[PDB]
Symmetry: D2
Subunit: 501 residues, 4 copies
Amino acid sequence: PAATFLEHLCLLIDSEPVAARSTSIIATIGPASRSVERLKEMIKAGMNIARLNFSHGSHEYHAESIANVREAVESFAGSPLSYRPVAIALDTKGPEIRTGILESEVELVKGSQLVTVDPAFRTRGNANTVWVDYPNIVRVVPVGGRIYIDDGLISLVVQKIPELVTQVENGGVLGSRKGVNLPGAQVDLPGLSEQDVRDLRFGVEHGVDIVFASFVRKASDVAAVRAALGPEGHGIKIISKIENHEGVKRFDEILEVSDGIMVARGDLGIEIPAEKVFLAQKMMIGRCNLAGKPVVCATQMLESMITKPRPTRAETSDVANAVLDGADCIMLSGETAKGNFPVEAVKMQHAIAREAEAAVYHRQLFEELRRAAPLSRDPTEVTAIGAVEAAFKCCAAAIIVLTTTGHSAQLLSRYRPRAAVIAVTRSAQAARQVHLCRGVFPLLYREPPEAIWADDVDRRVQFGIESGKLRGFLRVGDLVIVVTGWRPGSGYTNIMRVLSI
Amino acid sequence: QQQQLPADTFLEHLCLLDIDSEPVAARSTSIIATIGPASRSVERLKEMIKAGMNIARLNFSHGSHEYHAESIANVREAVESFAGSPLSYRPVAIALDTKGPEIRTIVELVKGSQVLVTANTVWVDYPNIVRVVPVGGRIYIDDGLISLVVVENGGVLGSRKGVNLPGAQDLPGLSEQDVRDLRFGVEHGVDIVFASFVRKASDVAAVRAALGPEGHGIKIISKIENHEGVKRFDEILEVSDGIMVARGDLGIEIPAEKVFLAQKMMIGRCNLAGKPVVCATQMLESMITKPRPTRAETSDVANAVLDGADCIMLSGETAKGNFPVEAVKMQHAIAREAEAAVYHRQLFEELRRAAPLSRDPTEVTAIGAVEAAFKCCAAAIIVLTTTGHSAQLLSRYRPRAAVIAVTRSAQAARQVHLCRGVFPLLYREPPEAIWADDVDRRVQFGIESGKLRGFLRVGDLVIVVTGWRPGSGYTNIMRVLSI
Amino acid sequence: AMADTFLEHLCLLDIDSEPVAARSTSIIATIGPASRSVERLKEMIKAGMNIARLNFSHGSHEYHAESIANVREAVESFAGSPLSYRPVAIALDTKGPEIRTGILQGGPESEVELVKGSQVLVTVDPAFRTRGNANTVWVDYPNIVRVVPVGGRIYIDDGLISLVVQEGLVTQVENGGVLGSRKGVNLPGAQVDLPGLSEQDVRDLRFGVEHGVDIVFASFVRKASDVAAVRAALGPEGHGIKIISKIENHEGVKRFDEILEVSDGIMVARGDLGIEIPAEKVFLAQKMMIGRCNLAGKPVVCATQMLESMITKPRPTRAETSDVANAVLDGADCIMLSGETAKGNFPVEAVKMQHAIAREAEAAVYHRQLFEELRRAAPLSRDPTEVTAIGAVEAAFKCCAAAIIVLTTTGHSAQLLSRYRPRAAVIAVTRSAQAARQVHLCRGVFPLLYREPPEAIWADDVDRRVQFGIESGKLRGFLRVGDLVIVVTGWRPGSGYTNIMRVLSI
Amino acid sequence: QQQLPAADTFLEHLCLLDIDSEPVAARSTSIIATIGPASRSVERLKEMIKAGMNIARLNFSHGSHEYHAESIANVREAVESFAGSPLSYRPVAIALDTKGPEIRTGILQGGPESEVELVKGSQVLVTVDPAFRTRGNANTVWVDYPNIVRVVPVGGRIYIDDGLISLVVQKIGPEGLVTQVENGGVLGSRKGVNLPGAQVDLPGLSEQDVRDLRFGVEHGVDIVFASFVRKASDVAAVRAALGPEGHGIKIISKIENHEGVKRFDEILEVSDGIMVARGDLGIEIPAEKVFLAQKMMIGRCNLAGKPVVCATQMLESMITKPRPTRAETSDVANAVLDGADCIMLSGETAKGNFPVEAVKMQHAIAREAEAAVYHRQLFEELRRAAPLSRDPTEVTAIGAVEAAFKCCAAAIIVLTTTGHSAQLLSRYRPRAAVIAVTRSAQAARQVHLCRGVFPLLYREPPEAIWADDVDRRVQFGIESGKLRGFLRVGDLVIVVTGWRPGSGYTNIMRVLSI
Ligand SMILES: O=P(O)(O)OC[C@H]1O[C@](O)(COP(=O)(O)O)[C@@H](O)[C@@H]1O
Ligand SMILES: O=P(O)(O)OC[C@H]1O[C@](O)(COP(=O)(O)O)[C@@H](O)[C@@H]1O
Ligand SMILES: [K+]
Ligand SMILES: [Mn+2]
Ligand SMILES: [Mn+2]
Ligand SMILES: [Mn+2]
């Protein structure tokens, strides 16, 4: 029915979704969700990627978090057909600026007159004193320069710049060690601080699967993340976070060099006017779709759930619209790191996505994507679009790719099939990183290779099919599109066959 | 370029939204703000008008008759304070929001504990409750944040809060209080009735009947707030002047995951029929407490504009919060950016295509005017309208150029805010002897108000729409004039 | 016409769907022996001729003065009823730089047969200009032996005779056949350097102005400067004359875009064009130019061999029927007749056929796609006239307007409306007799010459003209009671001030 | 090349047709040529093959059984003369064109190759009287359909010779029709007559037609163009007559009159494809309307994915002159641009003085026209319209086409047993050539019925190991491909094949580089 655009819309509430939701969900790990038991709960509810937010907590503290995710995850390895892998994502600290330690709450008051970088004063913070961890602030913020504290809920205007006389423009309840922002001011603060490099090495050492790299402003920024990531970490997927004007202006350059993007609406939402983020968001998602790289929508999607068990009408709506925009993943932060309803937040994102996903007008979408996408000569894309097409023609229940590094699956999702892309792979990491791609569902294949190749292929396909039935992707009578390669290894995907279940 | 000038597809389109492309243009989506303690003061009202309020909502769920007579007295007072300058005067509509069949509750409720409906005792003003909630029947309290199975979800309960009984069905659309309320409305010349809990054609019939003879002029916007309302939408729409997607109630009556569908569907259908549609509730909540909205709220506003909504609302945000003006400014600012992001191309084509042939000279002139507008990047379309009807016809098609509507009907100049992209001008002079001349004076009036407010500058082309003889229903001419 | 796609569209063409509507592609007929008679002309006017073509490749000045005298005479024979009077334009077709064979050996009407596989000499020799035989033809383009290489083709007589170059050029007869006196010679792939404007051409053009022809079809136009000359020659007395450039060879095709910019319109001269370039390729040339012209909003004419067999037979072949329809469906503003009406035994019948095919093809147009497509492609504009025009078209579609009635002084406003291809008829009222003629060059326009002297009060003059259009409208069966009509007019008298659109009921 | 710059719209598209854009690619519209005195000679046939003929039409309106057995003997002989190199052998179909319920005048008075003039305003007599079978003259035409005198009423019109001659019947009578000539002209022997508006009780299948059809089977013709098809049941008969020995024969229904046009949808469903017989059609219905009939049927055929043939007078003047008129050139192109799968030649190759030259021209026009198709719109349009399907073969097919577009595939190489898979591919109108490899000689012939398919007959005996047999065939296709200039080093090709041997198991698409 619902599947013009107007027309489409007009035909969208009792049409029960039916299908693996495909927008994968990223949840940040924190006190509210570090416990193996809680993690297991969140896995059941639909978390696919676990975010470690390195703005907080020590190395040891995160090694615990990983230890636990890994623990919660493997607790299901008891049935290979049902095992959901889970990716792990290191979110980098980058050039944050932050206030000192005071869970007491100093009230900064509208109009009252001091930002200091004096070591001694590094905890002497008061109703009239706030100290900040970026010495250069006193040199980069001119008279009538605006300073923001805590998610931009606090505003100060610089009025006298020896030791920053500011006046509180927007006051509020200030807490411990909070994000500071200096828009219109050029931060010479480096993309890669020593801590960031340590943090990244840690990452590799512990085999995280994805680096969400904060404050990416330019191609060279992701180069560093790569260098730091070092040789041991070429497999790591680097997702550039876009969080400020420059990032937005150099987006095209950033996208080219990165594996994907995150629309970091939090910072972005203070660095540029609030009325504008939507544009930035819808724009980068578009461009990303066009290039066929993962894009992540983030921050405050479900805030009030930090405190309440139900989201607001806007948050529901936000989630839907991100999916309808084309986002590959959606995220949770405060919602799962500190709040009183982490599992319930995950369940909600899972539920909205499934409805939003059923409302996509693939028609327009696939045509649009086909149309825009330039010719290509790489057999893999060729097979991929070929597969998608066959998939539409017959309402394929699913497309089952054999993939070594996920790259073939990615190519399929690029074109947004409606049929599920069931990816079979022996690379445990690949099976994790692929959650970065809308509509892909990884299956980790454990058996050792058969002697005769073909047979190995057949075993894997049949493996996918079997896991398929078990999980209710495919039922007898369905047609399935199978995509595979002429010889073993990666980069040789080149075959599409049409099989009946 | 500006206003998102820099496509052939929607994808393409999206890919070219630019963040430095300064919006430039009267925002079109009109803003509704609910009046309450945070905003009943003449001075505060003046502030909100400057920020962009166009409709004032009186929420009859709360406060007495006298208390609202005060609010109207004030809105009127704030508004007329600008009548010092006819070229600049912004009318403001007044909308009565009906109480309808609510259920309400003068401590923390703990998860797992028993709570009796009549710390563990809550009394309710719907007696039939004990008769319609069976064993396993869910009872929700306060904005659906508190849950009760005949306590599932705990939380802080306050005094007299919304109660909902989903899956359960009897309470009349029109209670005696509602009728009094409506009479009050007519008596005080409200311009619009947002009618709560509309579930079926006959429901709006009553609102009309109650509204009585003295109130045929009153526009009746039906609030959709529950399953039934959603299922009978097509019938309700036919009979109503337009719609409100009441996401609050709706968002408890049906699963939360689903409202977006309801919303995008109704807005589509309304667009199709050319009736105003209003998006409402929680668009900017956190601003009830904080001076800045969350990234989701920003996003919500834009997407309602981009969905097609004619008006967007504010409730807690302007009735009780600490940042009413600041909430209005925000809606105004989002709308303007979302409006420059509309892909009129697809939109107009889509509307044209879908709209059936017609034979009414007015529609004919209208679509023609729009088309001319596009061809030249008209700065604006200037209609002379008696009841607004011709301005409405123009907006139907979603010109990008502004629809400047000149009218002597003060009320029409108000009710027209219900229509995306229209900008009313109330014309005060007495008629000229020679007709034509009267026409010319009005057009020129519109033009002059036009320059003054920065809709049109020298060199612009404007599309003028008028009628062959005086009275309504005779719109039938389109002229192309240069400024 | 209400289908969502072109495929769909096609699939719903109905053979019992009687056309109903003024055909809109105007027809151009060449005047010759078969059609110089006032009586025959009157017949052809009734049948639907709109433009009369005088082919200056043939006959003397006196001979054409007679043709014009006659057309004018046939035409004015109907001035007895202003409401019905069909103007008819007159078009001078230029001789330009031809190349021709001689007078056959002892015979200004006799026939030599050129045999397949035989040797033939082509000479440039003054003496031989009359000495044409079975192994010998002479030609009046001396440079030929210098521009045609070994293994180069020479086509003779409409391209029906063919020579390959293997004091004179040694040629094998590729394609043989019966050759007569003084016939056209073509050298494809070869470059010609003969002037666009020969002395004769200039005299011819002056003649044109002198006699008030309305249109110059200018032959062999290869480049912007070529139309400049035609304009210069046309002289001051002739600014009003519309110059339609004829595209007839490779160069013309390659410089099309420049030619188009400088011309009032185009003719796809498929005859010459169809020898200068390979035959397989003309369709491309034709469909391309018509597209481009549509885009620019200038008249484009499709011409030559549309109905040949009718020169001899009373019924066209299945291909010719097909050719006509496709030309209309391509977007051509006018279609032409030549041999068909100049010499053949069925001139009137040929005109009737073009009139009949066009009407069906016109009802098969998928305006939807067309108007959208035109809208879409047309750039913004700021000229009140275009603005009013597209606005009028749009209103027209919305209500299935029976017609659009423009008041136009130089035809310009009517042209703008047709640019967008309304389905409703464009009824143009004008006092300029010449404009009322030249407008036929614009698909879907129907001119009405208004004769009354101006009223004192302006407005009233306007009202009289509109009402004039209406009345002529009912009388001719364009509009009936109950119809809506879209009226386009101006705020003050003069040209270039069109700026109002009203919607009126009949 | 291939009109690559020629775009977001159709208008745009048109505006970019470039005359120096040399076509480059097998032409895909196959060409049908009627065999006749001008072209029965083995040598002439060989010439026509080289020029591009793909299907040979035997017109059973004329000549005896023996005369056609000769024509077939010859085509076959011309064709097999090239079997000397399997990589370049062009199969050629053979099509029996049925006589059906035609009506005809007699031989002319002692003038077999003579003529009579029928004069405007005079009295002609139509006689069914056998005695005057051959006694025709300026005032007398005898006709071979007896009932004519019981079916053409007073005031009823009779057309003779391609509609160029016209009689109005004014007096009915005990020995024939007393006509007044409404259109006159030079009449020849045994020419077709049409009774429009007058309904012809003449059977679709006359005894002769049945014999004719049996002959067909007996001699293994590949295609029956069935004349005057008016209704589903008409093709049933052709099938019945065709008998068991002839299920393989493709039956193309000729649409030649009003009824045919009105029942088209029913006829299409039951037939393997269609011919728009514009000759008859063009007299039975007004001439101004044929174009509509033609564009409509071709559209519908495209939609259903059945071959559609455009026919009659496409190049007439070439019967007499070595060069076609500007309209005929144009007619050919528009038929291809309309979507026609095959184009035909009749007079042009049966009798005229330039049969080869006529074939060459159609070949040359088609190639240019084929580079002008706006596949974009076309494939979208086809996709869009085509309903979901569940048959692996269609699925593979559309998918192959799509891959083809994505990379500008030089070709699609299918392995097909009965041609079915190749047909499914053309259905979607790829731009890339559909090279079909098959061991069925017949299939290789019948596939010419399908736009853009180029059959290759594979001769080697099967390999022991399947797969290897597959690989040999693909490689066979490739090799024939390079040799004929379809594919060059560096190209991508899309290969379509099956999981097991036999027909109906096509289900794999691979992407290979050359
Ligand atoms: O990592 P990629 O580039 O997606 O490769 C997918 C690969 O998976 C396969 O289907 C099977 O790979 P393996 O047998 O090496 O595990 C290959 O044919 C193909 O190269
Ligand atoms: O209110 P509506 O229905 O849009 O009517 C618009 C009317 O405005 C006019 O332009 C002027 O009306 P008035 O002179 O009464 O103000 C009329 O021509 C037309 O009928
Ligand atoms: K000439
Ligand atoms: Mn951030
Ligand atoms: Mn409510
Ligand atoms: Mn010429």
